[PDB]
Amino acid sequence: MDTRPIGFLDSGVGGLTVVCELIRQLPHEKIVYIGDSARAPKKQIKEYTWELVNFLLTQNVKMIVFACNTATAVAWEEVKAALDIPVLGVVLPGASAAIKSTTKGQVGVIGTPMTVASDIYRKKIQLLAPSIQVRSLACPKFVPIVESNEMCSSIAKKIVYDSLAPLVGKIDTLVLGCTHYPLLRPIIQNVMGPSVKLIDSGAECVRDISVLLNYFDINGNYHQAVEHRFFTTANPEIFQEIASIWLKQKINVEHVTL
Amino acid sequence: MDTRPIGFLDSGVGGLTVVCELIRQLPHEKIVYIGDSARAPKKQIKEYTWELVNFLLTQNVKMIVFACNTATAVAWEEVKAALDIPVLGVVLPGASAAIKSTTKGQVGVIGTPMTVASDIYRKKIQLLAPSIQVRSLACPKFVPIVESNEMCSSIAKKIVYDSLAPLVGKIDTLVLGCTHYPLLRPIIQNVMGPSVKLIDSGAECVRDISVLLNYFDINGNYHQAVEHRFFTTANPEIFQEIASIWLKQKINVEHVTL
Ligand SMILES: N[C@H](C[C@H](Cc1ccc2ccccc2c1)C(=O)O)C(=O)O
Ligand SMILES: N[C@H](C[C@H](Cc1ccc2ccccc2c1)C(=O)O)C(=O)O
């Protein structure tokens, strides 16, 4: 019965992969997505996140999903306990998925410099499972390559190659700790080898959403969505581009100023 | 960090399959299981369930799982909204799993006479997804066959055969709507044919538990369980038997009188 949309707060266009996963897994659910392209330390990030949470709230969402790994690591738990509606991040489900797929216990997590600096993935993994060895590594060149949509670029494959070098042959499972990275998946697989299982946090988060939607009895109509709404705090046009390619369809973005 | 056990309230020994699923999927979690073998209408079942909930509560559980389809259908939602700790049933996750696996939209759910009379599975399936055709059918001879542990019995296979006749070739997916039935799985598959996907509610419930344990940040120690405790309101010895076979190990049952 609940026709209210699920809200997504991202730091830019990265979270959009989480969205493509939702549309893929729960075609009937409606979406409210706000990506704070503009703006860019920690305490300051909480403030920014809250601004985006309040907006999602004024959009009557039944749920809020932190599609941003950094935001999750900094405010997720706080915002989660301060609201009555469900709030989940992409970090925990990716860590839990990794914990369960590790064969030897040597886990590698890559991601944004800030996500890695927050060291959230390590702290969660070794909190639920202390014995597992976690190896984190920032890949600052990955995000720019994705937004360029030049993944097949042999120039890109080199960056992926050189960037992962430090982890090659040292881990049994690698966590794509940035929602941008699922677009570099094939390349990442090759560079690591078929012996390394890759965990897509965003995708693992969507699989958690259905379970949560059930548990809190707030599902939408399974046979009916189309009323999707996207908000960005800057670069509305470049946003439409990237978003229209990943979601394979032109989408209407609305320039917002919180 | 949460070392509190997960509580299981069953109507007898059936729920034990849900337990074997937990032990299988989350070996580290601890268990408190109460099966009300004694006692046996609707309003009266709520009272009985509550008695078992209060007991589980006096056992300091961090979660309560209705391992009984009938109890779930009658009190789950009530007890769930009256407690601060998480409470999930086996019905919803089995219905949601069926909704998602149905190819044509012709779903068949079997189970206990009471579960079927409650018509809970139909109501939930056509509530979340109105267009799906749901065909329910009581198999009162199934439970007795399982407790006898004579499944390979050609006499049993006949009962399974004749009991499912009404659904054969009329559904694309069949829901094992009784926690007892997973033990008759092979037989049930043959009688339906490889074109029918079977949904094991109990198993689908356990897969939901991990997601919930995460969400409510109440996981136990992943590397440590052994402190499992079983309580039955009658027939403690016959209980030890059945339980020791399904769980492949002698287990200590405690005769309780709520
Ligand atoms: N996800 C990266 C940017 C983030 C930075 C960032 C992290 C959190 C934010 C929260 C609210 C508004 C803006 C934010 C920006 C990162 O490097 O981890 C990107 O989309 O380029
Ligand atoms: N699960 C069946 C018994 C149940 C009956 C039943 C249903 C709910 C109960 C709740 C509390 C105490 C006893 C109960 C007994 C059924 O037929 O659906 C069995 O184990 O034989």
Curated annotation (Swiss-Prot), chains A, B:
Disulfide bonds: none
Active site: C68 (proton donor/acceptor), C178 (proton donor/acceptor)
EC number annotated for this UniProt entry: 5.1.1.3
Recorded superkingdom: Bacteria
Keyword Cell wall biogenesis/degradation applies: yes
Single GO term (MF): glutamate racemase activity
A Pfam short name: Asp_Glu_race
SUPFAM superfamilies, sorted: Aspartate/glutamate racemase
Keywords for the protein's UniProt record, in alphabetical order: Cell shape, Cell wall biogenesis/degradation, Isomerase, Peptidoglycan synthesis
Statement: the UniProt record of this protein carries the keyword Disulfide bond: no
Catalytic activity: L-glutamate = D-glutamate
GO BP term, pick one: peptidoglycan biosynthetic process
Subunit relationships: Homodimer.
The protein's name: Glutamate racemase
Species the sequence originates in: Streptococcus pyogenes serotype M1
Gene name in the database record: murI
